[PDB]
Each structure stands twice: as structure tokens, then as C-alpha cells.
Amino acid sequence: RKAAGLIQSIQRIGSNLVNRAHLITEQLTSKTVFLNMASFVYIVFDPDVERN
Amino acid sequence: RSPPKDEDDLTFKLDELILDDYATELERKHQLKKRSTLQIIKEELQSRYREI
Amino acid sequence: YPADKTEEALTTFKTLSQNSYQNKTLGNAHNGRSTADGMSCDCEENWDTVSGINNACGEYSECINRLTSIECISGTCSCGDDCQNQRFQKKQYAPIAVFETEKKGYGVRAQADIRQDAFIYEYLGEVIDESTFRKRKENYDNQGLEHFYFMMLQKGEFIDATAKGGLGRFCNHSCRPNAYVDKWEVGNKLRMGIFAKREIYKGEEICFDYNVDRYGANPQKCYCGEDNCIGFLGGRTQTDSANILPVPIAEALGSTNAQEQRWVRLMKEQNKSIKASDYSSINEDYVNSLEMRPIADKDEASKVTSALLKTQDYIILRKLIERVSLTKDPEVLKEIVRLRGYQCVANILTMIVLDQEQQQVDVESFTLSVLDMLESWPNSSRNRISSSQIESVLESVKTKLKKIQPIGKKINSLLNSWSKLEISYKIPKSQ
Ligand SMILES: Nc1ncnc2c1ncn2[C@@H]1O[C@H](CSCC[C@H](N)C(=O)O)[C@@H](O)[C@H]1O
Ligand SMILES: [Zn+2]
Ligand SMILES: [Zn+2]
Ligand SMILES: [Zn+2]
């Protein structure tokens, strides 16, 4: 149930998650749930896209 | 921005680090057991999200 | 090296083989005055019988039209057909490729070694009037495009490279460019070509000076990486009184557009000399007459640190240090510590009290004016100092000016205070 809520929240915000911290700053997840799931979900980083 | 001869990135310099003294100082200052975490960080830095 | 992006760059726009015209009246040479007596070079056609190439009007030939930036036209000139001064018409561009590096977008690189003064590539686009240019500029600003694509062909006539053009639109600005744009006459039309300012080797990026008129647009930071970079994309100021010192440096001193206006308005308009816009020479009188207010913003602290790393003038550093003396916000000082202000202050000391371009009494006053905030700033570890080792410079200057005992005693107190602070760890490395 939490996965479907997370997917719907991401699709509301724009179907793209820029940063891991946005699971907390955008109120998408709670503190302990994020603390559990932070290192097991990842965002592919492309150096050509992020020059900064 | 200017990798050396036959090296993709500077991640090979991590093998010169003495992680044991760093873990000892972490345990002394902050009372954190992070000896395996330094190894996990080193392995992940050398190859981001390997196939385990 | 970086992967080729030539086809990917080509797909982003409609490729043109030649310049397109909004109407037949625009782009005509001599403001549309048809020179029926077209300028015919007196060169005799030099046909090499082996290769069948007409070598007339070459690079090292004495073709008058080539020197005067005019292309020979076949059937009208004595040089004959297929002469060596039909570079625009024959479209004999240099071989180039498209790639990506640093903070730049797509960029143009030389696929082969290119000689000095050699024609590289003809800048292509749509020839448009001023109103069409204004409309397209407003549309692109609404679209949020962060790239220039307009060049001034001549007065009232512009070239747009946004939707249609050539590979030349991918050339990036360099403050020390290896190529330059020039204006040439081909027939009754005007063209804009790009020529090599020096010898360029294979793989090197091809760049030219934009000399961009903003028309009131905001400055864009320049990330060319050249040592002589001014830090922002622009050109000549829109009027006098606009700058006396570089922005970061001027804003570091607390000066703004109004304070830079006021000095020139008070003297230049009242028969007193102020030179043109050039930051190579610092006008000490302006810096002395400037007003100083305490710093409470961290971006201003970063600009101060940049000014310390850039400016060599004694008087600008004096007034910046005085402004720091007025400054007492601890967060700005912590930011300066993060920026390693001690590192910059070491060089600022060295240039004035180790190198001697000034007088000993004035240098003594400077040293007394710069020891105070060093005594006053919050410090909690010698690792801050270790990023600068400014203590060594302090020992050197107290030893050099040992006759001036107040400086020595102040540096004694300063090193005594700094000696008691804590230290932070560095991971040992295998041996
Ligand atoms: N040295 C430089 N530093 C930062 N941006 C630059 C630059 N040279 C060019 N640019 C950027 O490129 C624009 C010109 S168009 C150059 C091609 C474009 N960057 C692309 O890859 O599609 C400028 O308006 C500016 O936004
Ligand atoms: Zn000729
Ligand atoms: Zn000719
Ligand atoms: Zn620059």
C-alpha cells in the first residue's frame, strides 16, 4: 500500500524524483519509513547532465 | 576532468587509505561502529551499484 | 576524447546550405546601391594543367579583391572561373566536429589542423529586419531559452540561427578566442565568415569573441575557463559612468551602480579627468572617496574573497580590510573562514609588507589596520589556520619590521591566542 501511495505522489509532483531528500522535503514519506528505504532506492546519475 | 593513463577515475586512490584508524577515531569521538560501513562505501565508490 | 555529437547537433535544427532572406531588399551590399561597375581584379588566370585547378587569386597572391574582403565573381573578373577567392560561394568549409565538455553545451572542434587566417565556416541563418528580430527575441525570452543565436549583419539587419542555420551556432564564447568573425562582400550581398586568428591543431575547440550587446538583458556568467576571463558575457558599456572597477570587486567595496555613477557625474561633468573603462589601472582617489558599510551577506563575502584573490592594488585592499573592520557579523566571518580568508590575507600582507612598493609608515598603518580583525574573528581550531599557514607570514613580517615594536607585540598576542586552539583529524595513508 505504501508503494502505490508513493508512486501516486511521484506522479502528482511530476513523475521524476530529483534527489533522495525529496522523499522528506516534499512530505512524500515519514521519517522512519524514509530512514529504512533511503539506501535501497537509487536515482541514476548522468555526469553529462549534471556539470555542477 | 583529466583522468590518468588507463584509469577511468581516481577511485583507485581509496586503496591507500587506512580505514582501521578512521574507524578507531570514529568510535572514540562519536561512539559509532562504522568499520564495515567504510568498506561498503569504498566498494560502492569503486563501482556504483554492482551486481551482487 | 569526448564522444562525437555531430548528427545529434544537426537534428536539433534545420540545416541550411546558404543564408535565407526575409525579403529580396535585405542583405544587399552598399545599402542596395547596385554597383554595376563591379570591382574586377586584374589577376590573370593561373590554371595548373596537371590538377586542372585555377590557382589565381590565392592566399599568397596579390589579388586586390581578396585584400579588400570582396569575392571574385565568375564571368565578370579577369581571374576566370573557379579562382581561389570563391570560398563563400564554393562553400569550402573547414572540417569540423561537434562534442561536449565542462559546463558548456555542444561545441565545435577542429577535425584537422587549420592554418592561420584560413576560412573556417560561414555563419548561416535567416536575414531578418529589426521588428522581426524584436518579435523573435520576445518569443524566445517567453520560451526561456538560455542561448544567444543572433548576430548583427549590419545596422538594422540581423541574422537568426535559432531554428535554421549552420554548424557555426555551436561555437562558444572565449575571452581569449582562437577565431574571429569578419564581414565580407560576395557579389551584391554581404556575408559573415569565421577566420582563424592563429594556428589551430586537431581536436582543439574553435571559439570566437561574441562582443555581445545585451540590449538591456541581464548578465550571464562566463565559464570559458580562460585566465583573462571577465566573468560575465557582454561588451562595451551602454554609456560612461557605468563601471570604474569590476563588479565583484566594486560590490566587494560596497559600491554599486549608483556609487559608480556618482563619482564620475561629480567630476567628469565638472572638468576633471576620468579615463575610459579599463580595470588594468586602479584609480586610487575613487577607492579612497568610496563609502564603507558593514557586510551582512555571504554572497558579498564571496565577492570580497574574489576581490582579494584578484585585485593587486594596495588601496583597494586597504578599503576592503577597513570594511571588514566595520563588519562584525559572525556568520559572514565563518563564511570567510570557509572561503579561507586567511589564505588571501597572507598574500595581501606579503605583497605590501614583504614586497615594498610603498612607504614604511603607510605599510605600518596598513599592518595595524589588518591585524585588528585577525585578532577579532571567531576561531576554534588551528585547522582553519592550517589551510593558510598565515602564522609563517606573520613571523616573516615581524622579523622584517622588527624595529616597529607595536606590530611585533600585536603579532605576539595573535600567535599566542592562536597557539591554544584544538586540531582535527586526517586519515593516514598506506606507505
Ligand atoms: N564560455 C561559455 N560559458 C558559458 N556559457 C557559454 C559559453 N559560450 C557559450 N555559452 C552559452 O552558449 C550560448 C551560445 S549557443 C552555443 C551552443 C549551445 N550552447 C548548445 O550547445 O546548444 C550562449 O548564449 C551561452 O548561453
Ligand atoms: Zn584576383
Ligand atoms: Zn578571382
Ligand atoms: Zn570568459
3-state secondary structure B1-52: CCCCCCCCCHHHHHHHECHHHHHHHHHHHHCCCCHHHHHHHHHHHHCCCCCC
- Whole-angstrom distance, CA of residue C358 vs CA of residue C55: 63
Residue (of C376, C372, C373, C364) closest to C407 by Cα position: C364
Residue (of C322, C241, C242, C244) closest to C285 by Cα position: C244
List, in sequence order, every beta strand (DSSP E) within C197-288: 207-208, 220-221, 232-233
**The amino acid at C1:** Y
DSSP H helices, C199-313, are 247-252, 257-267, 284-289, 298-310
CA dihedral C130, C189, C235, C214 (to 10 degrees): 20
Give chain C's end-to-end CA distance (angstroms, integer): 33
Is residue C286 within 6 Å of ligand 1 at its C-beta? no
- Interface contact B16-C430, CB threshold 8 A: yes
Among protein residues, the one with the nearest Cα to ligand 1's atom 13 is C147
Residue (of C389, C250, C408, C371) closest to C316 by Cα position: C250
Ramachandran sector of residue C32 (left: φ over 0; alpha: ψ -120 to 50; beta: rest): left
What is the crossing angle of helices C360-376 and C314-326, to 10°? Answer: 30
CB C193 within 8 A of CB C88: yes
**The amino acid at C107:** G
Q: Which residue has the cell 590557382?
A: C55
CA distance A52 to chain C (A): 8
Take residue C13 and report the three cell numbers written for it. 535544427
For residue C260, the Cα-to-chain-centroid distance in whole angstroms is 21
Query: Using a CB cutoff of 8 Å and minimum separation of 24, what contacts does C244-250 make?
Result: C244/C274, C244/C283, C244/C286, C245/C279, C245/C282, C245/C286, C245/C287, C245/C316, C246/C279, C246/C310, C248/C303, C248/C306, C248/C307, C248/C310, C249/C279, C249/C303, C249/C306, C249/C307, C249/C310, C249/C311, C249/C316
Take residue C419 and report the three cell numbers written for it. 597557539
Question: Rg (Cα) of chain C, in Å, rounded?
Answer: 29
Helix (H) or strand (E) holding C99: strand C96-100
Ligand of minimum distance to the alpha carbon of C89: 3
Q: Tell whether the torsion through CA atoms of C320, C326, C332 and C335 is positive or negative.
A: positive
Question: Rg (Cα) of chain A, in Å, rounded?
Answer: 12
Take residue C375 and report the three cell numbers written for it. 585578532
Residue (of B44, B45, B20, B46) closest to B33 by Cα position: B20
- Which subunits sit against B, judged by 3+ Cβ pairs under 8 A? C
Which residues, in sequence order, are CB contacts of C338 under 8 Å at separation 6+? none
- Whole-angstrom distance, CA of residue C347 vs CA of residue C393: 9
Which residues, in sequence order, are CB contacts of C209 under 8 Å at separation 6+? C173, C174, C175, C177, C180, C181
Backbone φ and ψ for C207, nearest 5 degrees, come out as -140, 155
For residue C7, the Cα-to-chain-centroid distance in whole angstroms is 30
Take residue A29 and report the three cell numbers written for it. 514519506
CA dihedral C9, C13, C15, C19 (to 10 degrees): -130
Residue (of C218, C301, C219, C221) closest to C254 by Cα position: C301
CA distance A20 to chain C (A): 24
- Whole-angstrom distance, CA of residue C228 vs CA of residue B41: 40
Task: Provide the pairing of β-strand C189-196 with C172-173.
Answer: unpaired
CA dihedral C4, C7, C10, C11 (to 10 degrees): -130
Collapsing DSSP states into helix, strand and coil, what is residue B32? coil
Residue (of C386, C393, C399, C391) closest to C415 by Cα position: C391
CB C190 within 8 A of CB C27: yes
- Whole-angstrom distance, CA of residue C294 vs CA of residue A21: 36
Angle at CA of residue C176, ends C173 and C180, nearest 5° = 65
> Ligand 2 center to residue A7 CA distance, Å?
71
Q: Which residue has the cell 578507531?
A: B24
Take residue A46 and report the three cell numbers written for it. 548522468
Buried b (16+ CB within 10 A) or exposed e, C54-77: bebbeeebebebbeeebbbbeeeb
Which residues, in sequence order, are CB contacts of C141 under 8 Å at separation 6+? none
A52 vs C contacts (CB less than 8 Å)? 103
Strand order in C20-21's β-sheet?
C20-21, C126-128, C157-160, C150-154
Take residue B31 and report the three cell numbers written for it. 561512539
List, in sequence order, every beta strand (DSSP E) within C260-412: none
Helix (H) or strand (E) holding C109: strand C106-110
CB C333 within 8 A of CB C379: no
Helices and strands, counts by H and E, chain A: 3, 0
> In chain A, which residues are last before a break of more than 2.5 Å from C to the next N?
none
How many CB atoms are closer than 10 A to CB B42? 14
Give chain B's end-to-end CA distance (angstroms, integer): 29
Take residue C366 and report the three cell numbers written for it. 596598513
Residue (of C196, C223, C214) closest to C105 by Cα position: C223
C102 vs B contacts (CB less than 8 Å)? 1
Interface residue of A48, A50, A51 to substitute, partner C, most C CBs within 10 Å:
A51
Header resolution in angstroms: 4.7
**The amino acid at C118:** A
Take residue C225 and report the three cell numbers written for it. 575557463
Take residue C168 and report the three cell numbers written for it. 557555426
Take residue B45 and report the three cell numbers written for it. 565508490
- Whole-angstrom distance, CA of residue B31 vs CA of residue C286: 57
Experimental method: cryo-EM
